[PDB]
Symmetry: D2
Subunit: 116 residues, 4 copies
């Protein structure tokens, strides 16, 4: 609800299904602490990562396991993973969607931040 991840595949023209996604929150000692994770669904979406109560301001990292995704499809990939790092800021009501568009040697990411 506060945070959704969506992953698309630029080679096949499809959602990127069954991609592992790990979210971390930066701790006080600057290390990355596990926060939430899951696998994208048949629509390429990963819902239910967190709740409003749990998702406080801070620095988050979303790691998308692109390498395993490509290897499951039999395609040779460049990256280890894709990492999206951002600050969550409570500037009134907000929902964050982190979207990624994957190719073997490239990826694109955007944030769609809306007031629900």
């Amino acid at each position: 609800c506060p945070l959704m991840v969506k992953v698309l595949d630029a080679v096949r023209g499809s959602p990127a299904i069954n991609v592992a996604v790990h979210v971390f929150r930066k701790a006080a000692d600057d290390t990355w602490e596990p926060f939430a994770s899951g696998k994208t669904s048949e629509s390429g979406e990963l819902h239910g990562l967190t709740t409003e109560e749990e998702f406080v301001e801070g620095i988050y990292k979303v790691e998308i396991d692109t390498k395993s995704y490509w290897k499951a499809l039999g395609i040779s990939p460049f990256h280890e993973h894709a990492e999206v790092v951002f600050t969550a800021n409570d500037s009134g009501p907000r929902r964050y969607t982190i979207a990624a568009l994957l190719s073997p040697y490239s990826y694109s990411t955007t944030a769609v931040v809306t007031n629900p």
Copy 2:
């Protein structure tokens, strides 16, 4: 239903709302004939462009009026518009989503083609 367009804004991190979208189908004489049009909604999506009966195989052009979108936001843009040209092919049941991610001097587009 068979064809949806979604437009996102990379500068503001938001759906691209109220963007005009024109779809054309290539005619026998190679000209582009108007086929469907609309404006993206508050979610950046444009539904209801066509129906299964109307959307036959052929070459289609989706023109996204990016210049007017940026000017309504007070941002100076490079492109006249963004044009996505593709062939619709009846390889079993298919839904097409044409997605575009806009910046003033760049855009990205992908096709998400799924079997419903």
Copy 3:
């Protein structure tokens, strides 16, 4: 020199070699008139399309023949071409680099505009 095109391949992580590019300019009667054409080199770059004298103000369309590129590599891609449409030189001469990053179901384009 005033207009260069660069094309990269996001599947292979390489320049996109031997990509045909056609440039058109909108004529007074609103049709697209041929302006220049060429193909990308081993570096993915296409230089020498035009000259400072010939590259006057106007609305230009750079058509990158992405389908032909993919088909020659044995791939069936989604798009027919990538088209980049922009007004050039409207505040005096500029140098334009039009870049494209290709995948079978997606492309991205950017413009770099410099004042010489």
Copy 4:
């Protein structure tokens, strides 16, 4: 020479000048060790990060300091940085160009890998 980074700005249509870039290499104990750093020139390019001798096999992370770039232009961007993580030189030496295209709420990255 074996590792170059190029950064472009999708808002202005320009090279992204004075962008700080930090490269790390995974050490035997799985931590990220500093490897090289620099900043992009007026062309948006960063050359001379490393040498053929120093750029051995390994897992490398190229951190592009996009937030610092935007903040110096007076813009509040979404991401903290753009990180590009890849195994290099695993089948012998290659030349790598890591490119990034920046917007306030989005970025794209690609790799061009060539065999010298």
